[PDB]
Ligand binder design. Structure first.
Ligand SMILES: [Zn+2]
Ligand SMILES: [Zn+2]
Length: 586
């Protein structure tokens, strides 16, 4: 019962409303972490995994109704609907508060209310962005300890009157005295609400992932994008990659991809060409701000990895596997092996029997249901990653040389393209297309995560570049690892071989590589790429890099219909780039 009167007043007001059995301020210590884990094992929420294979690690199985972030229940409650905009779900904030305050009344009966102080980004910073999550979920507390810098240090940073993001959460499952709880409490009624003006997050009904770990997307992207809008910086859905060349020079890249585009594989790249090395500072969120020298510097505001498990394996991402191998991990909805290890679809091992994510027996080449839930997760400290860059915890961040945007496209979009200038780069991000069941637009990979109007967000990107030293700005590139030939072959082998594309990108930044001037930007010819040691058909690489005018003419009305959907706040500068592309295509 410490504080910081503003924090204490808020906690008292919330507890008065939700009526928990007791209030606990968390300190982030190892002692606390093990105590909370013991209680989770006792509740059945966790089982302890075999410590010989994952030290200090646990498996949680969720209610099948609560297995993912729920976009349709996620809201931006700005004072005016336009400031939420077409990529957001809006409700009048007074109306929303009436609904949610009703839901929160008595919602924590029979439960401990945890008050969880945390810092987004390195503690060493001057004004770090601070938050406090109030939650009635012990699972949330433990995962927040991994995903953020949680506890004592953060609370100290708040001082006696420091600003912090108020983040309120309940699973919405009050208990009567002596009532037996379930392993994974939740509600059929869910809201994940953001109040951008006041920098507040209110979540109810889910204990899962981005709905409940309020640093993960709610703070990192939604609230932070609104802060960045007002304060002159960028909060983005980007991995941060450090690439080191044979001359032993480091280059930092920030890269945004939508889901199902192999983003984690790239973040933990093992280059396949001699003399090139890669290290990571993060694989999800990047916060970028101009430094004194006029360059853009990136910091990872998170402290852990929260990755989709299925598809992660030794043969495609051994670095992720090695990070997980060091333990201290909470797994959610993966399968349990006979020796207390874990498994998920895509992983090596061919286990003959498993217990699946619903607690049922599963048998190899027999059971027709997935052993792990398709959205199952590992939650693991970043500090364990064997290719973690030494700069990972530097509050000054790292200077960004290139910003990459990527998506999955069978046709049309070449393997790599460089923007003509910053404004063109913004257009390339703003019109990022990726395959859906045909092409979904996911601008900067932020479609579900913007804290304000998408058009205003594009204008913000435009403004930051206009007012910057142009020579200091990151160069912008678009990458498509997934282009296919008419017969369905993959034109580019991908994975570690993506290091060859990254080498072209570095060389372009240094003016040491050429390329063709095409209507869509600068695109290398096959001979501009290092394919030495790579058994690939040059004709396939040529096809991967082709820019076909007829294909791009068909792309135009898709882009135009997206730009119309962006609505009244679409920047003139984005429309300018559309018009210029159309003119160049002829
Ligand atoms: Zn994802
Ligand atoms: Zn992500």
């Amino acid at each position: 019962p410490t504080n910081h009167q503003g924090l204490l007043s808020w906690v008292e007001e919330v507890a008065e409303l939700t009526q928990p059995d007791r209030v606990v301020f968390t300190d982030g210590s190892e002692e606390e972490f093990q105590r909370l884990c013991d209680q989770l094992v006792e509740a059945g929420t966790f089982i302890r995994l075999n410590p010989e294979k994952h030290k200090n690690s646990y498996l949680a199985l969720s209610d099948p109704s609560d297995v993912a972030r729920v976009a349709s229940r996620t809201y931006i409650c700005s004072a005016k609907e336009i400031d939420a905009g077409p990529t957001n779900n809006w409700m009048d904030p007074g109306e929303m508060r009436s609904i949610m305050k009703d839901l929160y009344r008595g919602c924590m009966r029979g439960r401990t209310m945890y008050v969880v102080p945390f810092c987004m980004g390195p503690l060493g910073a001057e004004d770090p962005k601070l938050g406090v999550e109030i939650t009635d979920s012990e699972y949330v507390v433990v995962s927040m300890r991994t995903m953020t810098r949680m506890g004592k240090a953060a609370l100290e940073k708040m001082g006696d009157d420091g600003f912090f993001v108020k983040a309120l959460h309940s699973v919405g499952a009050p208990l009567e005295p002596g009532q037996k709880d379930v392993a994974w409490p939740c509600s059929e009624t869910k809201y994940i609400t953001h109040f951008p003006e006041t920098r507040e997050i209110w979540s109810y009904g889910s204990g899962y992932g981005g709905n409940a770990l309020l640093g993960k997307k709610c703070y990192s992207l939604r609230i932070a994008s609104a802060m960045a809008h007002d304060e002159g910086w960028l909060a983005e859905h980007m991995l941060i990659l450090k690439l080191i060349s044979p001359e032993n020079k480091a280059y930092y890249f920030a890269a945004a991809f939508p889901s199902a585009c192999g983003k984690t594989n790239l973040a933990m790249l093992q280059p396949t060409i001699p003399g090139w090395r890669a290290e990571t500072l993060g694989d999800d969120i990047a916060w970028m701000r101009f430094g004194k020298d006029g360059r853009l510097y990136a910091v990872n505001p998170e402290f852990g990895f929260f990755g989709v498990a299925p598809g992660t394996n030794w043969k495609s991402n051994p670095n992720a596997m090695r990070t997980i191998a060091a333990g201290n991990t909470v797994f959610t909805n993966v399968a349990l092996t006979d020796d207390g290890d874990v498994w998920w679809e895509g992983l090596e091992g061919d286990p003959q029997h498993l217990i699946d994510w619903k607690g049922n027996d599963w048998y190899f080449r027999e059971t027709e249901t997935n052993a792990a839930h398709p959205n199952s997760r590992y939650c693991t400290p970043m500090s364990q990653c064997p290719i973690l860059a030494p700069e990972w915890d530097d509050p000054q961040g790292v200077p960004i040389s290139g910003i990459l945007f990527g998506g999955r496209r069978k046709t049309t979009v070449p393997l790599v393209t460089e923007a003509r200038d910053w404004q063109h780069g913004v257009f390339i991000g703003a019109t990022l297309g990726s395959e859906q069941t045909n092409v979904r637009r996911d601008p900067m990979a932020m479609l579900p995560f913007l804290g304000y109007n998408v058009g205003d967000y594009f204008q913000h990107w435009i403004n930051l570049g206009k007012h910057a030293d142009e020579s200091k700005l990151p160069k912008v590139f678009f990458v498509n690892w997934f282009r296919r030939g008419d017969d369905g072959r993959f034109l580019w082998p991908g994975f570690g071989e993506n290091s060859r594309v990254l080498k072209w990108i570095v060389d372009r930044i240094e003016h040491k590589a050429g390329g063709a001037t095409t209507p869509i930007g600068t695109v290398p010819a096959v001979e501009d790429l290092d394919l030495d040691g790579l058994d690939v058909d040059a004709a396939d690489v040529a096809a991967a890099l082709a820019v076909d005018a007829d294909e791009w003419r068909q792309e135009l009305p898709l882009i135009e219909e997206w730009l119309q959907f962006v609505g009244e706040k679409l920047p003139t500068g984005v429309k300018d780039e559309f018009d210029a592309l159309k003119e160049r295509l002829g």
